[PDB]
Amino acid sequence: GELFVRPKLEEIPPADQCRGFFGPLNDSLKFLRLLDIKWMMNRAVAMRREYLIATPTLFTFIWMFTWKGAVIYFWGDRAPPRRMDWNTEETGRLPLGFKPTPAPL
Amino acid sequence: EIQSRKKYFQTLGYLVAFIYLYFLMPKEKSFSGLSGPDGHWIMLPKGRPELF
Amino acid sequence: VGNGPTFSTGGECMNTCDIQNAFPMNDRGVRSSSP
Amino acid sequence: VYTRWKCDRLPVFQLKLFTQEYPMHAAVGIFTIIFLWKHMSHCSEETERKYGWWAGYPYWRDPIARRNETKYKQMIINNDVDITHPKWTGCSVEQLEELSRVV
Amino acid sequence: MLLGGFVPRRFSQFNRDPCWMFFIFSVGFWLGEYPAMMIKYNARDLVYDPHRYVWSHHDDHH
Amino acid sequence: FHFHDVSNDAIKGMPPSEALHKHLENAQLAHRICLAKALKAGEPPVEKCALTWGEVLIRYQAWSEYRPPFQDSVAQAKYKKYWSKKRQEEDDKNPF
Amino acid sequence: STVAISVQGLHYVGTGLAAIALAGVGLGIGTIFGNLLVACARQPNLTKMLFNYAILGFALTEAIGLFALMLAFLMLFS
Amino acid sequence: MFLFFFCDLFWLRLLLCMYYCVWSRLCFIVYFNCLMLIFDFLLFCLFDLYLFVGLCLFLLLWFMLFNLYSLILYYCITYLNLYLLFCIVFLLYIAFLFLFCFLCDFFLFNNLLVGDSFMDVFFIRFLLCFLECFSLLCRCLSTFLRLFCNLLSSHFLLLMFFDFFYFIFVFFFYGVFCYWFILFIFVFCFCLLFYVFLYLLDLFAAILQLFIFCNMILQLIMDFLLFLLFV
Amino acid sequence: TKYELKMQYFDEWMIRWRKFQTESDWEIEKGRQWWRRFNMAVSGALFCGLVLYTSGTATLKRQYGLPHFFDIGVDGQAKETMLKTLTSRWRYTPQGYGRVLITGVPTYILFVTLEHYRERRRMQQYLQQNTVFGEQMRRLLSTGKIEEYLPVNIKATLPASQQAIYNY
Amino acid sequence: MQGSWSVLKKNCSNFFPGLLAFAQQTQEAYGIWLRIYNRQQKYGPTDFVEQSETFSPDYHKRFHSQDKNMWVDKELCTEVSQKEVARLMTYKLDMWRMAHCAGALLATGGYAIPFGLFWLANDTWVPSSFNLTGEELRAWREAQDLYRYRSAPSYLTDTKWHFDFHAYPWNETQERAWDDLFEKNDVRRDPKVVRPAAEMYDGFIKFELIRRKSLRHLCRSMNIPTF
Amino acid sequence: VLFSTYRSSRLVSKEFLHGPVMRFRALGEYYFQRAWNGTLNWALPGEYRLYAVMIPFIYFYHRWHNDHTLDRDHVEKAMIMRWGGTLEDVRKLSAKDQLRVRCFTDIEKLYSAYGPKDTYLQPPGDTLPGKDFYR
Amino acid sequence: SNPADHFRPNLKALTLYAERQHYVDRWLHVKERWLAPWYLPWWSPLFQLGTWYSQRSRNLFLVENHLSYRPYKFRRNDEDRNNPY
């Protein structure tokens, strides 16, 4: 819609002000910021880096709507059957008495 | 001049094509087999006994 | 006079088109169909 | 003065149009063509019989059978295939002769 | 865009322009093919095919 | 000779490999029968046994393409993950 | 046991259900025209824009009516 | 399998060659909005916002040569297939979308995260973002489906009505000479009125559907355009 | 030497005759896939390193400067360390075609060389196999042609329930 | 200029001498550029040396800024002479075209040979070093001028049309400058009258916001390869 | 050097086939190059006579093609299936019999979904041949 | 049904059939013929463009280990849901 201007360094709120799923992950809980997705989302919104939330989503949709959709439809593995036809590992081996051709030399 | 000549030739060609398509060309795969081809295979191997 | 065509108009009324000023106006008040 | 549409010949203008005017569209079109010819370019015999004929499949002459017969005859004759080989029949030549004498 | 052109005032004027002459000929064909179908397909001597129940499109498409 | 049963009902409870092999054997049997008839008649085999040979060919193509999956760690893990006791029991207590 | 059944007359039932969609179409047209009269009453000079937009929408509601009618004919003649 | 067939435009191609060997002005365009994207002066865009004009004009011409002339009896809409229209719309829509994505400006997608900071990010804003990213592809699908089905339904209805008209006209015209001629005359007048109404409706809807087919693409383009102000 | 032109026919034949694919050949193909992934990873790492090295000083300062998204303290320390390491010495920071070439040509060369040599390795592996696929590979390299229906000609091993066809 | 057999023979005859001359010019120009680059890195402004980032206000795409990313070395005469700078510029053009040709050769292996024949049949994209006589140099310059004539009008029309359709000048002096800027070469344009158009366009579009199509036209007009 | 990329590299003289080309342009321009022939996106002209001429011609050639190439297949299928299931069996009939059968097929086409259903549904007790007549 | 039959192309002229194996093999032969000459080194972008993606796809196919059955692409009959063979 309207032009977007990146916030200045002084306009960015401190990390400690961000909230997680339950509450702020302040001192003694900073390392939990890496694992809390909601805290990261709130931090990105505060820092005006909202694209981090939107770009992965849209692209993913595109990737599904273009390339993986048909790949799954045409070459994907369906559910296995009840009675499974496992491989006996008997096929392929050369028969007894066969004289294979020599390798290149 | 160039476009006039080109379009004259194109018009003649399209007239011939229209006549052939809508008055002479038989539709393929006829039920009675009296008109049109039934199709055939192409690109078949030739002179490759090892293939079989 | 001959039966030849003239400057094409595209079926537009030059007295109300978006570029009407580009067409000169005669004494009768009818804008020309050509420059 | 120079202009692509007025001065260049048709193939050159086509290349310019689809390379420096609508390149993404051409790329996507080629992608879609490849997909169509890779996954939507086959028709089984049953499908042809059901829907492949204007008025219906003329079973009274079975054109598909004749087409396949001509195909296989041409392949056999050109490639010099011995259709009597045990792999094709599943039995030895002598067994085949015995069966022929039996039936 | 339907802006202009010759427009006959009534039937009698359709002969005042070659294009409208062809148009009225085509209209005559269109409207006169119907009475022909009435006469042909409602004739006394028309008889249904005795073998009409042997085969029909209804069984074929079904 | 005896043709195997490859009807839908029989095929339903059969592994893919067995069905493919049965179809191939049936095609071979039909081809050899046609060849025997042609030899008895004395006519050339190519002029009579083309369609049967083609059927054998297509069955060979279908049979040689399929490789039954190897039973390994990941395959067994997938099979056990999908077929839980819950799902197997539900199937056992269900139609078809 | 495996049982395959083919009921003939069911195609009639589906046909009637599709026709019900027209109830939401015919009413939709009345809503547009109902609003049109009110709009024309308070802006008589601007009747041109209102009437044109009413007929434009009537076609974008008739399309949906044609959507259902096609399915009805498919399930009635096939 | 390779099928060889021909489009149903050969006569129209001949007419185009005959009548357009010389230049002529064009003033009436079905979708005129592709030429005037900016209405407030001093606004300009650095993106190639006028790239869609040529494709829009060609698509309008092609679809008009097909759909409008399809009203004529026995005329065939050679392209009338669901997946073919899907291919067309895929080409156009995805080409423009990849043009926007290749720009490598991630901030352009900021508007996808609907709403303001005051709404829960994970449970409100993010869900709505997912729904909108889904809505883009749904818009593509909707465009192609609408274009296909409007034509299919209209032509089905026309064929059915024409069959009924032929039946009654051929096998019940004799009633003109009978005592129940009034009923037949009423029915015939009703059928003529319906015939005219159907033809007018189809003629208007064929052009409206192209307006909307091009408008969807232009809306996709506009959803990512940013205008600078001259100073 | 161009191994791909020879190997394409063999791969197509294996796909058509995948039924006779022994577990050894399957492991060979899995190793080929793993090595392709490894080559991709190393090429990507090289490309990222070249991009970082040629990045402009201002670009590095913006990327590896304040603010800190997490502000844990380790993040800032690592960013400062990397920024100091990059900005200490002089770095050739080209732009345009120059950066494109510098960043890509090494990556393309590395990826192509690794993949070509891995293809040669896979060809050697298939040559050393004692299965029907190995025999087919040796025959292809010898006569220059792919011999289809080879498994049924030499009567390659089949399951105990599928040896009837060989009964001749 | 269209290809010709005479030009093809000329370029084929002088191919190897041209390559040798190009190599010598490459050595000389590398020396000159090394001097210039060292001077820029030593005495250049902090923004110019650090390659300060300037992003467009709409899509935040980086591009060179005329004020920050361009610097005039007023004291370059001490180290490098004017003739050396001209030599460097000419070699930059020739090296650009040769680099494009070499890239095509490397990419397509031995399949570029017929395209090389097409290349040698025209003087548009051959290096100046391929001309060993005054007449050959004159023909080469004529080809370059023909390319410039072919390309420039499109760039001028693009600029003028975009501005005139998306904006108008503020005052009468700017109007006169804009109108007189795009006059044909047959008439003489007063630089003083035309200068305010520079500020006006700075208000409209700076060099950091130049569009890709306009850039392609400009490169065509400057005999810079674009593919 | 082999082929020119510019349209100005003429392959023929300016006066080649001047007369026929001028006649063709005269045919094209007389009705189309007029003020009232304002096209809508090049597809719908403003001249009434263009519609009046082209609509009948398009309909005529399309109908001829449909009747002599498309519907003929259905007619032949009906004739074959209802009178032996083989082409020779149909040819064993006379031209008049084939005319009768084809006109009955046209009757069925005209009836379609509103005609009597006895044309394809055999009423119980009917003495006419059934579906298994030729089986 | 009958109304539905009116929406088909009306200018079908010829139909040609070709097995995937045959024309794939012919294309491979053409590609080998054009990529064989010595003046096209294996490390050139053109050769890699020609070969690498095909090799990757074929390798992905070979490594495939699916617990389900994928019916033959070119069966005589694929219209039956209860008969994958």
Ligand SMILES: CCCCCCCCCCCCCCCCCC(=O)OC[C@H](COP(=O)([O-])OCC(O)COP(=O)([O-])OC[C@@H](COC(=O)CCCCCCCCCCCCCCCCC)OC(=O)CCCCCCCCCCCCCCCCC)OC(=O)CCCCCCCCCCCCCCCCC
């Ligand atoms: C085995 C049997 C034979 C068949 C073999 C086939 C082999 C196939 C190989 C495998 C292919 C696999 C993939 C197939 C995919 C197909 C998809 C498809 O069809 O989609 C529908 C789609 C439909 O398109 P469309 O919308 O109808 O428009 C295409 C039209 O061409 C119209 O579009 P347009 O108008 O925009 O086109 C431009 C047009 C612009 O307009 C024109 O130029 C006007 C003319 C138009 C011509 C084209 C239309 C054809 C009309 C029907 C046929 C005409 C009559 C033929 C009579 C035959 C009699 C037996 O210009 C041209 O067409 C240029 C050609 C002009 C030729 C002029 C020749 C003049 C000769 C004069 C000689 C004088 C001699 C004097 C001697 C005097 C001595 C004293 O088809 C296509 O898009 C094209 C598909 C083509 C695929 C390539 C096929 C391979 C090439 C085969 C060539 C065979 C030549 C040998 C034949 C010998 C006779 C039997």
Ligand SMILES: CCCCCCCCCCCCCCCCCC(=O)OC[C@H](COP(=O)([O-])OCC(O)COP(=O)([O-])OC[C@@H](COC(=O)CCCCCCCCCCCCCCCCC)OC(=O)CCCCCCCCCCCCCCCCC)OC(=O)CCCCCCCCCCCCCCCCC
């Ligand atoms: C600028 C673009 C703008 C325009 C965009 C337009 C498009 C719109 C967007 C949406 C997309 C639309 C789709 C259109 C069609 C496109 C084609 C398509 O979809 O094909 C998919 C299709 C997918 O394959 P598929 O055949 O469908 O099926 C999968 C098969 O497995 C295939 O088998 P494969 O052998 O080919 O395998 C490929 C492999 C992908 O590539 C590989 O083969 C392997 C991976 C390569 C790595 C590359 C380097 C990574 C970075 C290295 C470090 C750099 C920094 C250095 C300095 C460090 C200092 C410390 O993919 C996978 O299967 C996944 C591998 C996963 C490996 C990791 C395992 C997980 C654990 C480890 C990670 C987690 C650690 C956290 C632990 C917890 C800690 C608390 O083909 C591919 O794309 C795959 C082949 C090509 C891969 C290229 C690898 C290089 C990637 C570089 C990307 C760098 C930029 C991204 C970030 C940008 C940031 C600004």
Ligand SMILES: CCCCCCCCCCCCCCCCCC(=O)OC[C@H](COP(=O)([O-])OCC(O)COP(=O)([O-])OC[C@@H](COC(=O)CCCCCCCCCCCCCCCCC)OC(=O)CCCCCCCCCCCCCCCCC)OC(=O)CCCCCCCCCCCCCCCCC
């Ligand atoms: C036959 C050959 C086949 C080749 C195929 C390969 C592809 C084509 C090859 C190259 C073709 C030539 C042309 C390429 C484009 C040139 C663009 C250009 O003009 O750039 C000028 C530009 C120079 O201008 P500059 O002023 O110096 O700097 C630019 C400004 O910064 C600009 O300033 P700004 O303001 O614009 O700043 C923004 C700028 C900032 O970026 C830059 O400019 C920096 C440079 C790029 C950095 C990219 C890496 C970022 C970090 C990646 C981290 C990944 C971690 C993953 C960890 C995984 C762990 C498991 O752009 C971005 O922000 C874009 C970031 C990238 C986003 C990527 C999104 C991908 C989405 C994927 C969707 C899903 C895919 C499918 C599924 C896959 C997964 C299953 O060039 C560069 O800076 C670098 C150019 C590099 C060219 C590509 C090199 C190709 C090497 C190929 C090696 C492999 C060959 C394989 C062959 C296989 C057999 C045939």
Ligand SMILES: CCCCCCCCCCCCCCCCCC(=O)OC[C@H](COP(=O)([O-])OCC(O)COP(=O)([O-])OC[C@@H](COC(=O)CCCCCCCCCCCCCCCCC)OC(=O)CCCCCCCCCCCCCCCCC)OC(=O)CCCCCCCCCCCCCCCCC
């Ligand atoms: C064998 C493997 C092959 C692999 C496949 C290759 C396929 C072909 C792709 C193209 C490859 C290059 C072709 C040769 C170009 C000539 C050398 C060169 O760079 O000239 C400078 C010149 C630089 O242009 P610029 O715009 O002035 O540069 C701006 C910079 O700011 C400039 O910076 P500055 O302003 O500070 O000024 C510096 C200037 C100052 O110097 C001067 O002024 C003195 C003159 C120096 C340049 C002289 C060039 C002479 C060119 C002609 C040579 C003779 C030709 C003879 C032909 C006939 C033979 C019979 O010096 C430079 O120009 C240095 C540039 C930086 C170095 C670039 C080279 C990097 C690659 C080489 C190292 C590879 C290591 C591999 C390690 C592997 C580890 C595993 O090159 C160009 O004209 C650019 C190339 C134009 C064609 C581009 C085509 C697309 C390329 C896409 C590639 C994507 C990645 C690869 C994958 C592709 C997949 C599709």
Ligand SMILES: CCCCCCCCCCCCCCCCCC(=O)OC[C@H](COP(=O)([O-])OCC(O)COP(=O)([O-])OC[C@@H](COC(=O)CCCCCCCCCCCCCCCCC)OC(=O)CCCCCCCCCCCCCCCCC)OC(=O)CCCCCCCCCCCCCCCCC
């Ligand atoms: C020994 C030497 C020293 C060593 C080597 C040194 C290095 C040399 C190499 C580097 C040289 C660079 C400089 C080159 C300059 C010249 C370039 C050029 O071509 O100029 C035009 C050149 C004439 O130049 P000019 O007269 O000087 O005019 C120059 C002007 O300045 C006009 O200038 P302009 O700007 O107007 O012209 C530009 C025009 C240049 O173009 C043209 O002018 C067109 C040229 C062809 C026209 C053909 C017309 C005739 C057609 C005939 C058709 C057949 C007829 C029937 C034949 C029957 C035979 C029995 O347009 C373009 O530039 C367009 C570029 C398009 C790029 C396409 C990129 C596609 C990328 C794909 C998408 C990828 C996306 C990413 C995907 C990523 C996925 C992971 O054109 C020709 O000479 C035409 C030649 C026609 C030959 C005959 C027809 C073709 C024969 C084919 C035979 C095939 C045999 C095998 C068949 C096998 C079947 C199985």
Ligand SMILES: CCCCCCCCCCCCCCCCCC(=O)OC[C@H](COP(=O)([O-])OCC[N+](C)(C)C)OC(=O)CCCCCCCCCCCCCCCCC
């Ligand atoms: C009666 C049943 C009716 C069913 C109807 C179902 C709907 C059908 C709709 C059809 C019409 C609409 C089609 C729209 C378009 C669909 C597109 C689509 O999904 O196609 C995907 C498909 C997927 O391709 P694929 O099927 O070959 O995938 C191979 C994947 N393996 C090997 C694992 C099996 O794409 C194509 O068909 C084109 C592929 C070639 C072009 C792209 C090449 C570049 C790829 C880049 C990434 C990988 C390489 C590394 C990077 C580059 C290195 C150089």
Ligand SMILES: CCCCCCCC/C=C/CCCCCCCC(=O)OC[C@H](COP(=O)(O)OCCN)OC(=O)CCCCCCC/C=C/CCCCCCCC
């Ligand atoms: C490049 C060939 C090198 C080897 C010499 C081959 C000579 C073969 C004998 C040719 C005799 C007839 C020549 C007639 C004049 C040809 C003129 C010509 O080529 O013009 C191309 C002209 C188009 O030109 P424009 O793009 O409009 O503009 C041209 C101006 N730039 O093309 C045509 O019209 C087609 C003309 C075809 C003529 C025949 C060409 C035959 C070439 C065969 C080459 C292969 C070797 C032959 C060896 C023969 C040994 C006995």
Ligand SMILES: CCCCCCCCCCCCO[C@@H]1O[C@H](CO)[C@@H](O[C@H]2O[C@H](CO)[C@@H](O)[C@H](O)[C@H]2O)[C@H](O)[C@H]1O
């Ligand atoms: C420029 C880089 C040059 C590198 C040169 C070689 C460096 C030294 C060898 C590196 C290690 C190789 O060791 C590698 O181990 C992995 C397992 O981890 C093996 O891989 C094996 O197990 C993995 C387990 O996931 C399977 O996916 C794979 O299919 C299987 O082959 C590789 O077959 C083997 O090659």
